[PDB]
C-alpha cells in the first residue's frame, strides 16, 4: 500500500476511525458529545489516578487522606476539584448524548444503543462507589440508604446485602471493596466504549435529517476534529468557571463532616445527576416497588429501540413528537427538583405525577403519537 497510514496494522485503525472515517456533512453540535464523553473519561481516569496516589481506603483515614490531599499535595486541591466536578461534566454530557439519540432515532442502531445503555449503567455504579470514598456524612448515609434497598428483594435479600457490605452495615470492609470497584470500573467503561464505537462504525453516524448521507460524506479530519476541539473548549469553559469560582456549588456541605453512623442527616439526597432517579425511587411507597421503579427508570432505555413507530427516523419533521420530547425533558427537570425536596406535600403528589408521566411518555405516548403522525402523512 502507498501510504503507511493504511497499510500499518495500527495506524490503519487510527486512520479508519479518526481521519479518513466517512462522516455525514450535516451532523450538528449534538454529535459533539461522543468525543466529549471520551475526553471526559480520559480526564476522570487521569485525575482519579492522581488522587488515588494519596488516598487511603480505611474508615479511620479516608476523610483525612482526602483532606491531606487538598491541603498538602501540590495542586491536590485542584485535582480533587477537577475530579469531583468532572463527574458532573461527565453526566451533563452523557445526558445530552442520550437526548440527542432519542430525538434523532440514533437508537435504531440497536447495538450501538445497547452498549450505550451499558456505559451509562457502569458510569453510575462508578460514581456511586466513588462518592463513598471521602467517607463524609453524605458518603456514608447515601451508601446506607441505597444498599439497604436490596434487603427488600425477597429471599436473597438480607444475603445479597450482607454480602455486599462484607458485614452487617456499611463499614471498613465496604469502603475497601468500593475503592477497588471505583478504581476498576472506569477501565470497563473505556473497554466498552471501544465496543460502542465498533458497532457504531458498522453503520457510520446518523444525521439530523435522518436520511442517507452517502451522497455527501466528508473526512472526519479536519472537519470534525476541528469542530470537536472547538466543542471541547466551549464546554470546558463553564466547567472550569464552576470548578475555579464556585467549587462547592454542586456539593453537599454535609460531606465536610466525617461520617457518623449515630447521626442521620436531615436530608439524605444524592448529587444532582441521580436526583431524577431518587425521586422515582421515593414515588412508590413500598421498599420493593420503589426499587423496581428505580431500576426500571434506567433499564427502560433498553426498550426504546422497540417503541419506534414513525416511518421517519428523527423528530426533525415530527412536530407532535417534538413537543412530547420537550415535555419529557421538562418532566426530567421536575423529577430532578422533586428529588432534592423532602418527602412531603405537595412534593409527594407532584413526584408521583412526574414519575408516572415519565414512563407514560416513553412507553405509551411516543409510540402512539408516532403512529398517529404516520397517518397524518397518509402512510
Amino acid at each position: 500500500a502507498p501510504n503507511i497510514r493504511k497499510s500499518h496494522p495500527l495506524l490503519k485503525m487510527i486512520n479508519n476511525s479518526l481521519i479518513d472515517l466517512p462522516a455525514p456533512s450535516n451532523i450538528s453540535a449534538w454529535w459533539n458529545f461522543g468525543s466529549l464523553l471520551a475526553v471526559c473519561l480520559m480526564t476522570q481516569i487521569l485525575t482519579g489516578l492522581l488522587l488515588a496516589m494519596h488516598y487511603t481506603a480505611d474508615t479511620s483515614l479516608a476523610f483525612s487522606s482526602v483532606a491531606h490531599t487538598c491541603r498538602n499535595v501540590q495542586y491536590g486541591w485542584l485535582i480533587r476539584n477537577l475530579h469531583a466536578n468532572g463527574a458532573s461534566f461527565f453526566f451533563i454530557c452523557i445526558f445530552l448524548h442520550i437526548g440527542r439519540g432519542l430525538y434523532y432515532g440514533s437508537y435504531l442502531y440497536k447495538e450501538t444503543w445497547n452498549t450505550g445503555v451499558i456505559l451509562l449503567l457502569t458510569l453510575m455504579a462508578t460514581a456511586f462507589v466513588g462518592y463513598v470514598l471521602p467517607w463524609g456524612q453524605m458518603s456514608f448515609w447515601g451508601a446506607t440508604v441505597i444498599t439497604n434497598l436490596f434487603s427488600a428483594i425477597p429471599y436473597i435479600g438480607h444475603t445479597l446485602v450482607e454480602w455486599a457490605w462484607g458485614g452487617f452495615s456499611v463499614d471498613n470492609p465496604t469502603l475497601t471493596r468500593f475503592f477497588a470497584l471505583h478504581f476498576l470500573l472506569p477501565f470497563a467503561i473505556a473497554g466498552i466504549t471501544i465496543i460502542h464505537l465498533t458497532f457504531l462504525h458498522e453503520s457510520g453516524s446518523n444525521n439530523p435529517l435522518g436520511i442517507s448521507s452517502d451522497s455527501d460524506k466528508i473526512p472526519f479530519h479536519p472537519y470534525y476534529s476541528f469542530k470537536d476541539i472547538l466543542g471541547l473548549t466551549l464546554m470546558l469553559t463553564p466547567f472550569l468557571t464552576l470548578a475555579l469560582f464556585s467549587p462547592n456549588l454542586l456539593g453537599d456541605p454535609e460531606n465536610f463532616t466525617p461520617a457518623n453512623p449515630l447521626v442521620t442527616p436531615p436530608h439524605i439526597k444524592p448529587e444532582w445527576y441521580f436526583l431524577f432517579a431518587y425521586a422515582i425511587l421515593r414515588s412508590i411507597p413500598n421498599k420493593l416497588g420503589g426499587v423496581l421503579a428505580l431500576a426500571a427508570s434506567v433499564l427502560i432505555l433498553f426498550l426504546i429501540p422497540f417503541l419506534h413507530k414513525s416511518k421517519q427516523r428523527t423528530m426533525t419533521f415530527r412536530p407532535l413528537s417534538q413537543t412530547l420530547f420537550w415535555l419529557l425533558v421538562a418532566n426530567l427537570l421536575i423529577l430532578t427538583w422533586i428529588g432534592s425536596q423532602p418527602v412531603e406535600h405537595p412534593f409527594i403528589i407532584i413526584g408521583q405525577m412526574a414519575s408516572l408521566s415519565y414512563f407514560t411518555i416513553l412507553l405509551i405516548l411516543f409510540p402512539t403519537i408516532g403512529t398517529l403522525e404516520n397517518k397524518m402523512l397518509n402512510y
Binding site: 483525612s64 476541539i229 466551549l234 470546558l236 472550569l240 475555579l244 469560582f245 456541605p253 463532616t257
Partner: protein, 241 residues
Amino acid sequence: GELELHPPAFPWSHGGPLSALDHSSVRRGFQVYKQVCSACHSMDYVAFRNLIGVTHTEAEAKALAEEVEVQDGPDENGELFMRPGKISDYFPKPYPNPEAARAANNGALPPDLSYIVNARHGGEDYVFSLLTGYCDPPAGVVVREGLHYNPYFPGQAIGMAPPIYNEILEYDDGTPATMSQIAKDVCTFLRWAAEPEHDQRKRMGLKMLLISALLTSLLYYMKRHKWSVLKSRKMAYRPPK
C-alpha cells in the same frame, strides 16, 4: 421544630470571584480563634507553619507554636513526655476525645472548625449571623436548662453560650474590638482555614478566563475557516435530460 431563619448575605471582601481574602482580617481572626474559640474548638487540619506567609512571619509563627506544650514520645523507657511546639505541629486539641469534650460542655460537642464554613449552609454568613444573633426566646418557647436561644441555630436552642462580646479581647493591631468586628474577623479566618487555596484558586480562575476567551475565539475562527469550503459550497443537478 419547623421554621428556620436563613441568614442574610453580607458583602465579604473575599466574595468577588476575583477578590482574595483580606489577610489583615484573617490575622485578627486567628487571634480570636487562638484566644477565644480554641478554648473549646479544635482545628485539627491547620498547623502553625500554615500561617507563615499568609498572616504571620516565620519568626512569629515559631513563637506561636512554642507557646504550646505537645506530647511527644515514647522516649528511651517507652515514656510519653512534653516538649515545646514546632511550626510543624497542628493547633492543639482542647479535649482528648469527644466524650471529654461533651463532658465539659453539658453533653454538647463543640465541632472542629477546620471546615465549619463549608459544613454549614450559609457558610460565613451563617456563622456570623449565629455569633451575633443571640436573643431571648419568643413567647410560647422555652429553652431547656443548659441551652441558649439563637434564632439562627436549627431548633433555635444551641448549646454554645454567646462566645463573644465587645472588648472580650484586644487586637494588637489597634482595631476597635466590637462584637461584630470580632465575629467578622473570625469568620474571615474560618474561610481561610477551610480553604487556604482560596486566593491562588481565584488568581488561577482569572488566568483560566483570559486564556479561555482568547483560545475559544481563535479556535472558532479556525473551525469556521475550514468549514467555509462547505458553507459556501454550491451545487447543481444537470441531467442529460
